[PDB]
Symmetry: C3
Subunit: 602 residues, 3 copies
């Protein structure tokens, strides 16, 4: 009639306790807890053996674990098939918990790390804090094929946060999404030599990363998000060496030396990421500071990039860096077949080194850019440049040895195509472009604020020599419009029916031009002879001019007209973009940097 | 040998009950519940004191709370460090629960609100229903710095859903993602005067908002998603006044008066949002109806917008509104250094007011647009317009007082650049554009279906006067092609070697043109003299013409040719875009709106 | 003084057991479990009646269910208002669980399916495995209006994964996000005849789908993501027949016959999806292999597509397929008012069939494309084509019967506009385009590597006959530049003031051209007469030429110059793109495919 103590305390004693359902308390045990196997959970007492017994019971009986205290442990723990919800694991700093086919939510991994060994693992709403192991979440030498969803976790205070080394059985599919990774000393997400993995997709999306500083650490530590296939680099190496079909989308990477990195990737997309590189972090690791660094990649797109560098522009403005690989220091594996678009990074610069050959196609597309320096090396079989707004262009087509990565390695004698449409090189009043070695068979160019010169690599080798006419103008008057630079081939049609054809691109300044005396520091010039408010002796802003003897130590000053003709103090006046250095005397001549030659028909 | 009642009912009595693990029931208590502290949970009985005792025990012993009933409470509850899973809190309407460093999942907050006071707070899969407080989730006067993940929650029936006021300690990082907010009477997500916050990122992403109607509420209530820095507005005010580096991405805002709002923002992106504004909601609050409203912002991008307004187009079609700020009613802080792209809103209109000066750069980019009215005021130092498809253009460059926000405030005498490439202004058969006060030093334009006129602000002030030749044509015949509008400077090259140069843009209609009598309502005209199927007397659709006396009260009818020459009833025939109003008699003349002048060479 | 067994085992017996809080164990029962109602949970014993009793108790008492074992069940179970966390349900293969207003997390549905009947249902972090029912998650004939969040679930081994049939009460809002669906035999996400649904939004986002193979299954089985309104198709059918305002964003669809499908959709966006179609799966179901298939849709955008087909290109390269609908085999419902952009699919092809009329507007925009074949049928009222990089163009404007879907059905006599800007048709050395029946009133074209011919549909019907001059060149020399194709109307301006006007587009090859003998397989030609390294007898790569008698069976060989003039073996040499077939003897002539005619002025 009464309850016996030894029956109530037995392993079936809970069956003696009724519940509102009409069932009993034994039927309510849908979980176990570590404390039932001897765990103290005070974060100090060594609970390793209790955790091991909990895992064995959970595995043996296929029952989930619930926990809420803090289990100090001091040697490796191996979990397989476990569902674990809640609690904190506290290691010695870098103590390992391995997982095969485990599902873990709401857990904190303090001063320890998880190593995934395979199966379908799922990690949601966990915290990985203060690991002193190489990585806080490691995939390495998996013993069975895996899939992974690693989402809505927070990671901080560690070295590497997420690290994969591709040796062993493959991860066939993985999603790394919506994680918050911050204040770390290695890489945030690094998937290294994983070319055999992710046949059914690698997606790294909407992760928020902040403060990645590997200063004092080893070589190449400190990347934000990195994905790497396997060398050797080379234009014709097998597809199987590359990591393929992956996507890096919607991530935010703040205060990191090299925010996004791919090497030996193929058929991938880097889409709509926001990056803030900083030269001041990860000092000594050898990484090129930038937002996106791609080495030896093929068949890829970069679409959508915002941000700027946190350091002063005098240290670096490099944001996009696309380069050849290197095998034992020798350039190899030019980037080919790629599309770069929607880079809204006006403070920051783009540096691309590519190539082109008769032995393989390389088609490049660059579109919808807003950047600082646009620097380019290499001459693809076809290259298009559309709606690029930049502050300067530094461009060599078939670059040679000493002119950038892989210079001199490949040439293309067959049909080579280029297009420039709707681009703008402008920094205030200055149009600053440099083009060379563009050995094209056809180059379409229209709508730009500059001309693109093309060149011939041996007589006859690019067909008949032609100059594209990119500018034509109508004037109501007959005199040649003064003070304005026109490219070679420009045609001016007059209302009278006369026509001017520019045979040497440049601007017209009369031989009778005279200016007033100038003093050091002056940024305006005034006419002492000609009517600068006439069309024939006009002065257009943006035109490059030379003021004899006004530069350093009586050299010639090359500058740009900053403001077109105006009258002040009863004198025709222009502003210049650079100050007088050496004073000049009354009735000095000004002239064009590039003096025009034209012929007039009728 | 038997179990004593007073031992079993003691605080350690559960240790007497064995479980299958070999442990005991005391070791299975990984949580507490409010009912253990006296809560009834019937949604009616006042459970405030029980909740307070639960929170104290959870804090004191660092133990999570589990709950599943409905706890009525009637005064403020303050939580710190709590993990709470499940249950409903029911207040009096606007009763407060404050949280510092709390983690809450699967909770319903009914007729109450949560105020975050700091720490790392995390809110997932909760419901915030029927709050009558100002906000359902409030961040205000935090006492410690915070981070927030507020994701996959549902909010409805309230006034403001999410509201931050920036006074107090800062939120260093926050993610507001994948929430569902609907049927509210204030703003859905409003982060106000938060310029000091979010140094490590503000991300508002993939939220779905529906039915925001603040009718009858106070001024500026009813914004969908709003972010605000601090005034005063001004082009040169310190960066520290602006909310910076944030992103508003992938959100859907349906049936809201002003879907997305930023003021005093800098270095931000508004990307891939879908918006359905409605003039009929939030009546009386003073908000400008639109999808995106930006005031006094700098260094920003709007990229990717879809949707349309739910009201009739006769009320409004305004979708994108980018404007100066106002300080005590005076315009201040022009939007500068911005990029607007990928707006696929063909029914809806864009209104932008900007500026340009010698004292600072302003570079604007507008690209890849599909809209209704394109309305623009202001003359940046550089502005590019590319692949804009619109139904009309309403454009003033250096707008003066009375021509829009900040008109007359700033001018730029230095080099001013503009580009129009590949744009289309078309509404059926009509090309409707208006441009004025474009005081540019250089304007590149190509590939448009209209010409852009530029102007001179004082003789000589923009260099030699030139007309860009945007159209050249070849004809196999010598006669000037009739009935088609050509801009000034157009060149026609004939197979014979003759050339025509258009010195006054317009179309050719012979002085001998005669039409048949017309009646009111007629939308075709027929020739009574000339062969409209000849090239010299041709009739091109899209050309603007004048029919003397055919308009209202015998005024001239200005219309557009809707269909080029065809024969019906044995007569040359064209269609017109507007009906005859006043009948016209046989042998009335038709003429161009803009009569051409050209010269012929040879 | 002692505990009585019958009191402890009663429904209030738990109140006798004290807990650390000072409360009792009865107050800790925040849930029930199925085992408390007789469930065995061994995956074999029939637990149907126990599950039913659990659901009744949970409903009656409004209490959540916790579970962790495996409940075999054998007939339908109906849940309403239930919160269920954990456990596995195992059916007979296709046993049904219906849900109204249910919330389910961490559940596995094995060999069974869930049918949603309405209310606010929420499904997170579940597994749907090995269903043999038609669908694993079904929405059909709902009895109350619903909303759905179906997110972070995994589904595999089934026929259809997610299926909606729109009969019954409507889903007003649904989010299907971040699911992982793989290895299935029906569609992954199919929402069929849902035009009345989703008034407040349908969002299908960030789902990862792999291996959809409906081989041997019924007609149209095997779509990845499909959304369908209701027929009949037609340009003027009511808006209420269409599914509207939905979005398909950020999804990945791998190894599926037709990855994304819409029919009878309006005002929708298909944005930033990654697709890998495969002709080898879903054999026999009648689906057109492609990444995006749209039928009879209006007012839509496709923006952002990457991927390629997994089969060999010789089977198919079709990636984007936009077509008319069909009513009982008759074409109906042309796609109108659409924007296609940012397709980075260089290996794969685009096929679009549209139309244009006087009775309705159709404005199309195609921009920023990188594709293989660009195939187009139809003549909209306005169409723009910008920055399209392709390997060939197959284009008919006003296509007739036998020239594609709906050929001959509609024509537009009113103003018809077209624009081609900045496009490139190039495959190595070949520019391969075909255009016909472009009956435009105005066509702006600039910056392309090809000319677009326009046509006249009756004398006078498109205004005066004009040829747009797309290319003008300057030469320092007077002789006509040889060996290079120039379109009709091209103007060459010489430094001397002479001018050449091309009256018949083509290339110049002198009548005195002679080549050395050739043998079968040869891919170079050598001069036996003229100096190919002169400008007048030059040889430009990309130019099409004819070698008499060198083709199959002594026919003429039409080929392309692959490499411009070079000297080897002391002979002027060019390479050709196709090998000699029939040998040719010494002093055979080579000529242009398209011989130029030009006139010289002066
Ligand atoms: Cl190489
Ligand atoms: Cl560096
Ligand atoms: Cl101001
Ligand atoms: Cl309004
Ligand atoms: Cl139809
Ligand atoms: Cl097929
Ligand atoms: Cl001429
Ligand atoms: Sr598997
Ligand atoms: Sr698998
Ligand atoms: Sr911090
Ligand atoms: Sr290859
Ligand atoms: Sr690709
Ligand atoms: Sr300067
Ligand atoms: Sr912190
Ligand atoms: Sr922090
Ligand atoms: Sr509703
Ligand atoms: Sr500034
Ligand atoms: Sr920016
Ligand atoms: Sr009309
Ligand atoms: Sr409802
Ligand atoms: Sr509703
Ligand atoms: Sr598999
Ligand atoms: Sr319609
Ligand atoms: Sr639309
Ligand atoms: Sr985009
Ligand atoms: Sr070939």
């Amino acid at each position: 009639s009464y309850v016996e103590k030894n029956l109530l305390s037995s392993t079936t004693g809970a069956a003696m306790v009724g519940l509102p359902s009409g069932g009993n308390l034994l039927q309510a045990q849908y979980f176990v807890t570590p404390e039932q196997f001897g765990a103290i959970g005070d974060g100090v007492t060594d609970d390793t053996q209790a955790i091991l017994k909990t895992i064995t019971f959970a595995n043996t009986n296929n029952i989930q674990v619930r926990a809420d205290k803090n289990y100090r442990f001091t040697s490796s723990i191996a979990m397989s098939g476990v569902r674990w919800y809640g609690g904190t694991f506290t290691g010695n700093g870098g103590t390992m918990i391995s997982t095969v086919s485990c599902w873990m939510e709401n857990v904190r991994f303090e001063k320890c790390y998880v190593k995934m060994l395979g199966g379908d693992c799922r990690f949601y709403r966990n915290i990985f804090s203060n690991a002193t192991s190489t990585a806080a979440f490691l995939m390495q030498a998996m013993t069975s094929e895996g899939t992974l969803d690693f989402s809505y976790n927070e990671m901080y205070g560690c070295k590497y946060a997420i690290l994969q080394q591709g040796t062993g059985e493959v991860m066939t599919y993985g999603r790394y999404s919506n994680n918050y990774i911050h204040d770390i000393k290695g890489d945030a997400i690094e998937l290294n030599v994983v070319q055999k993995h992710y046949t059914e997709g690698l997606i790294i999306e909407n992760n928020h990363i902040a403060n990645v500083d590997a200063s004092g650490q080893g070589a190449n530590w400190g990347i934000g998000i990195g994905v790497a296939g396997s060398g050797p680099y080379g234009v014709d190496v097998p597809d199987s060496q590359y990591v393929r079909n992956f996507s890096i989308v919607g991530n935010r990477v703040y205060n990191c030396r090299q925010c996004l990195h791919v090497e030996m990737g193929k058929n991938f997309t880097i889409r709509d990421n926001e990056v803030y590189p900083n030269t001041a972090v990860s000092t000594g690791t050898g990484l090129t500071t930038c937002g996106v660094a791609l080495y030896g990649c093929q068949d890829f797109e970069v679409d959508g990039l915002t941000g700027y560098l946190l350091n002063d522009p005098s240290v670096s403005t490099r944001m996009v860096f696309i380069d050849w690989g290197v095998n034992n220091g020798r350039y190899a594996g030019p980037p080919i077949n790629f599309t770069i678009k929607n880079l809204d990074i006006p403070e920051s610069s783009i540096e691309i080194a590519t190539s082109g050959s008769d032995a393989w196609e390389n088609s490049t597309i660059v579109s919808n850019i807003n950047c600082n320096v646009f620097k380019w090396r290499g001459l693809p079989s076809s290259s298009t440049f559309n709606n690029i707004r930049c502050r300067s262009i530094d461009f060599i087509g078939q670059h040679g040895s000493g002119e950038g990565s892989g210079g001199g390695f490949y040439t293309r004698s067959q049909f080579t195509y280029m297009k420039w449409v709707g681009c703008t090189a402008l920094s205030g009043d200055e149009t600053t472009v440099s083009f060379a070695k563009i050995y094209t068979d056809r180059c379409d160019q229209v709508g730009n604020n500059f001309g693109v010169p093309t060149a011939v690599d041996g007589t006859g080798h690019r067909g008949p020599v032609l100059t594209t006419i990119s500018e034509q103008y109508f004037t109501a008057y007959d005199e040649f419009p003064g003070g304005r630079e026109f490219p070679t081939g420009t045609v001016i049609h007059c209302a009278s029916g006369k026509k001017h054809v520019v045979t040497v691109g440049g601007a017209f300044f009369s031989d009778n031009e005279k200016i007033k005396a100038t003093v050091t520091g002056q940024t305006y010039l005034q006419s002492n002879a000609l009517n600068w408010a006439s069309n024939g002796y006009a002065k257009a802003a943006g035109t490059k001019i030379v003021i004899p003897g006004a530069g350093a130590n009586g050299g010639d000053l090359v500058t740009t007209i900053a403001r077109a003709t105006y009258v002040t103090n009863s004198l025709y006046t222009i502003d210049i973009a650079d100050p007088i250095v050496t004073p000049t005397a009354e009735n000095t001549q000004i002239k064009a940097l590039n003096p025009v030659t034209f012929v007039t028909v009728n």
